[PDB]
From a paper:
N6-methyladenosine (m6A) is an abundant, dynamic mRNA modification that regulates key steps of cellular mRNA metabolism. m6A in the mRNA coding regions inhibits translation elongation. The majority of m6A sites are mapped within mRNA coding regions, where the modification can modulate codon reading by aminoacyl-tRNA (aa-tRNA) in the A site of the ribosome. Here, we show how m6A modulates decoding in the bacterial translation system using a combination of rapid kinetics, smFRET and single-particle cryo-EM. The mRNA codon adopts a π-stacked codon conformation that is remodeled upon aminoacyl-tRNA binding. m6A does not exclude canonical codon-anticodon geometry, but favors alternative more dynamic conformations that are rejected by the ribosome.
The complexes were prepared by mixing EF-Tu–GTP–Lys-tRNALys with IC containing fMet-tRNAfMet in the P site and mRNAs with either AAA, m6AAA, Am6AA, or AAm6A in the A site. Specifically, 48% (m6AAA), 52% (Am6AA), or 46% (AAm6A) of ribosomes failed to progress from the IC towards decoding and peptide bond formation, compared to only 4% of ICs with unmodified AAA codon. To further elucidate the structural basis of slower translational rates of ribosomes decoding the m6A-modified Lys codon, we separately analyzed ICs from the same datasets and reconstructed maps at 2.4 Å (m6AAA), 2.2 Å (Am6AA), and 2.1 Å (AAm6A) overall resolution. Despite the high quality of the maps, particularly in the decoding region (with local resolution between 2.4–2.7 Å), the density for the m6 modification was not well resolved. Given that the nucleotides are clearly resolved, the weak density for the modification likely reflects its rotational dynamics. Surprisingly, in all structures the AAA codon was in a π-stacking conformation, which—to our knowledge—was not identified with any other codon sequence in the well-resolved IC structures available so far. The π-stacking was stabilized by the interactions with the decoding center of the ribosome, in particular 16S rRNA nucleotides A1493 and C1397. Residue A1493 in helix 44 (h44) flips out of its helical arrangement and is involved in stacking with A1 of the AAA codon. The stacking array extends beyond the A-site codon to the next nucleotide (U4) from the downstream codon UUC and with C1397 of 16S rRNA. With m6AAA codon, τGTP was 8-fold and τpep was 40-fold higher than with AAA, indicating a significant slowing down of the decoding step.
Author numbering:
A (entry chain A): 2 to 272
B (entry chain c): 1 to 46
The structure:
RNA sequence: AGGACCGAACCGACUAAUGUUGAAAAAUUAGCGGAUGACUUGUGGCUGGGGGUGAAAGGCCAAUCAAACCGGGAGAUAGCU
RNA sequence: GCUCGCCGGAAGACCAAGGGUUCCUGUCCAACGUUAAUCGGGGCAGGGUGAGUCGACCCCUAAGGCGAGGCCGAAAGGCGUAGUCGAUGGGAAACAGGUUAAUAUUCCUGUACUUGGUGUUACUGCGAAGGGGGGACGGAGAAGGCUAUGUUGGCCGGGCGACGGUUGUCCCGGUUUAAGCGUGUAGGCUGGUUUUCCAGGCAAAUCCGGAAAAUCAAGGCUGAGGCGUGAUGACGAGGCACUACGGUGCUGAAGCAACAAAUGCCCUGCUUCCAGGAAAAGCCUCUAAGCAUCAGGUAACAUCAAAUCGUACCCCAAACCGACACAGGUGGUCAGGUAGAGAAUACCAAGGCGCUUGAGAGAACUCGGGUGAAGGAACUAGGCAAAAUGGUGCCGUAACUUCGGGAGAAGGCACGCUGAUAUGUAGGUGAGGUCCCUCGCGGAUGGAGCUGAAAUCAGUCGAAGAUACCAGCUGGCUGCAACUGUUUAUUAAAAACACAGCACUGUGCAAACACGAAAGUGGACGUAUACGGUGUGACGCCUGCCCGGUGCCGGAAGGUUAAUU
RNA sequence: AAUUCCUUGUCGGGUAAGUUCCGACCUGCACGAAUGGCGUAAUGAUGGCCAGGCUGUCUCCACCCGAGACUCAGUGAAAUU
RNA sequence: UGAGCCUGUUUGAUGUUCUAACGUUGACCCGUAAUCCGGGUUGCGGACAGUGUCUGGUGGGUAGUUUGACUGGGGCGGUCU
């Protein structure tokens, strides 16, 4: 649900929250945790290579299963959980042989449901099959790009992909950007779409909210001196030049892709 | 008012010590220069 | 509940007087702002000079910065005093 | 030696970092000490630091560093695997009294605890570089149980007062005791036991995870305080005999109860929120290769061991960082009384100091302060500086508004002391005595003793009762930036920077982009509801016309055009 | 008008007297729509103007309490020439 | 399908197909007690991609420098045979 806050303070006047009562209140499953340290945007030379990163809350990593092997064994859903590393919720599942795992939670999945993977599974949300075995015209998420590698497309909150055609050993997909693409028909996918579709209806409200997530302030190039940026200088407010990046490359229109190795798999670029 | 020099033995020894000088090719050149000049104290280590 | 209110410890530096071969190569006395947060503090670590870092003042990098310090080319050149 | 003054959340006491003999005793006054010096942190000589339990060393890892083979690079060299280092974090064990001129949880007296090696006896399936458990973790809030510690009464010893009174409802002092061992309470969490089966934990498993039956309803873990012992002991005002002025030998009274009460402990607990809150070992279990007469495991006794380095002194300062015996800077711990909301402020306790030139006089002028007839901003660029308001309870309070605010708006009234209601009220705490029951640190009744607000009525003193310290000035019209925040260390704190929100554009993952001759690394253990660049800057109503010039995006017919031949 | 040279433009308000201030007119030297246009409650050690209380800021200065300046004894500098 | 020689031969261009050079930051086995490295088996690409030498375009991202004299001061104006 989406809730507005009341204006008891100027920092609270403009806050909208997404509240979900079905998420677990407790500690996560321990045998599937690891430590994760912060970088500040620095590489092994010690230099800043990506700007505006630093600080925030401490987080631990949850091992999620993007391969979805283990065909033939049904699994049941135990609970849904909050994860600080991504923008989608996760789910804990228990197999009939006594094994536990974390998976991405689709839309409409509760506690007490069943799921399966393999060539001879049913067509229902949460099940996994190779795309050679899925009817054309379907909506899927968590799609592989090589057989046996793991999902790499449509993993964010509310996203999905469409199967548009099949021809020979390949299938054609429509992606969220508007692109049409080709992939081998032996790849795997999951039925449905990713949940938590209200994630984009939240307003942060104050600068500290962005600071809580590890984001540092942005300084405009027009406010610097000529020795710092191509946009600096002036007696007052002056621009008089075509906008460029901090390293002298034109922004606002120029294209940048160059990869002749993969050009045979793009059918039509995004419009 | 706070000033520039604030002592610490561990940091002193990790920065300018004998083993630090020996760990690198230029530090050995510092040691050779000082030996050729004939200094009574070669490094900061006691 | 809150980048909420009044106010000590703690962190700052808006006004005036003194001081200017000072008690002090930037301070003292009387007032002043924040004070559960984008807060403050101890120990260790990483980024090196046409390079770093910068909520951006050409600011800071050991009382030195529109290109640090030390040694060398070196007795640079000086139609000038 | 007697009097006076100053600090007392410090200007007292104990440490880490840093320094290194400044510590104690004898002797000297040339130089050092902003003056004299018989004195000194000065010169000279001698003395002083005692550990199985405090620290370091040692076992274990974080950020990061180095790195056999390896990949890459004109040389020099760069990055990295198996490994090995690195605390600011995890890992066994000790208390009270006495003593030196100078050391003490180390020396002496009394009473304790922990980890290993070897031997004897009695029972017995042991075994890891591997599997499982544990260690093991955020912010804020509330109120119940306690202790440190304080006040008063009872008890014991002493006193009867330099000037009116003081055998009493009077005055002064003391009333202290640990670790360990036994008991398992206020309280928190969790159903217990047996049998059978199984695509999981690389292989195995009696251990963990999962499924199906029967049976019992009470089992288990954690836990402050109090009580007993330790203690017929030690300490203790004072007395019996001399003093080297530091002290010796002996003796030695009382040593209880009530109330108030922490920011400390139960609490790594409980309730709630989103920004979702370290690693490895020590420790408890499970088996594999292997050994099974052996070796090994559990318990009881006897004996041996626990090495090496630090330990003096200063530590908000004359011993550290500032060239100085410099009005500056420097992290942790302890927290008495009266008034007070308080760690503010005033006066005191234990304890520590009067800051290393003095003595006179009482001119102009300069510095820091107190008071002012009549007027009340006439001063000045400008009410600059000064003067003024200031507490608690109650009455009462406008335009405008994003409905939260504006608001402590503005402007008012009461306030000391003594008596009664009530020889101390409403509340709080709680002993004897009487019953109940598995019998205990139990339940019900009961009210002695102690402690104790606020209000109303009638009186009374002064010019003044929030009497000292402490402690908001208020209202009306307008420019700029929505707001909390940031910045020119040392003449500029602002309308400048950032910000939540909005829009354009790039980017299909070996992503775009950035650091790198390269190998590689960040972006990210992320995947278009994601990530990078550019401009505007909460919110409300909005954002018109121009593609001729310079950029960017698409086209490919015609003209011009490189190496090469 | 943080924008207007001519300019102290012209009219109204506030004062005994107002080149600054508030409300209007339009002759915009040389405003104007994300190098954004017009508004806006709350907030500000931010710029401008008017009131009450208060006063040694002032007419115009007078007295007092402390630290120096002055005299005695000890020590004992500086810029410049 | 266009050019040379006596239908056949030599040599260009365009378009399908193939595997054996080359790529793999897909899966499995070993060195091994190892998310680096090498070898082996198997999928997917495939003479494309990528690197060396030569060559045309773009290139204030970075570097080395030039930007005259007379003159009732200099600049603006005028001038220099």
């Amino acid at each position: 649900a989406v809730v507005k806050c009341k204006p008891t303070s100027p920092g609270r006047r403009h806050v909208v929250k997404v509240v979900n009562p079905e998420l677990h209140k407790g500690k996560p499953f321990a045998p599937l945790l690891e430590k994760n340290s912060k970088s500040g945007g620095r590489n092994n030379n010690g230099r800043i290579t990506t700007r505006h990163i630093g600080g925030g809350h401490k987080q631990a990593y949850r091992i999620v299963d993007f391969k979805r092997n283990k065909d033939g064994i049904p699994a049941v859903v135990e609970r849904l959980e909050y994860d600080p590393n991504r923008s989608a919720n996760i789910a804990l599942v228990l197999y009939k042989d006594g094994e536990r795992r974390y998976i991405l939670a689709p839309k409409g999945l509760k506690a007490g449901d069943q799921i399966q993977s393999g060539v001879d599974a049913a067509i229902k949300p949460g099940n996994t099959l190779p795309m050679r075995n899925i009817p054309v015209g379907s909506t899927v998420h968590n799609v592989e790009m090589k057989p046996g590698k793991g999902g790499q497309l449509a993993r964010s909150a509310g996203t999905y992909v469409q199967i548009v055609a099949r021809d020979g050993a390949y299938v054609t997909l429509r992606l969220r950007s508007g692109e049409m693409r080709k992939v081998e028909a032996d790849c795997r996918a999951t039925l449905g779409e990713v949940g938590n579709a209200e994630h984009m209806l939240r307003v942060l409200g104050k600068a500290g909210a962005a600071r809580w997530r590890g984001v540092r302030p942005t300084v405009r190039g027009t406010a610097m001196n000529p020795v710092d940026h191509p946009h600096g200088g002036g007696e007052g407010r002056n621009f008089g030049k075509h906008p460029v990046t901090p390293w002298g490359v034109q922004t606002k229109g120029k294209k940048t892709r160059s990869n002749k190795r993969t050009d045979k798999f793009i059918v039509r670029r995004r419009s | 008012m706070k000033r520039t020099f604030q002592p610490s033995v561990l940091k002193r020894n990790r920065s300018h010590g004998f083993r630090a000088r020996m760990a690198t090719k230029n530090g050995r050149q510092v040691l050779a220069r000082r030996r050729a000049k004939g200094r009574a104290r070669l490094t900061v280590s006691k």
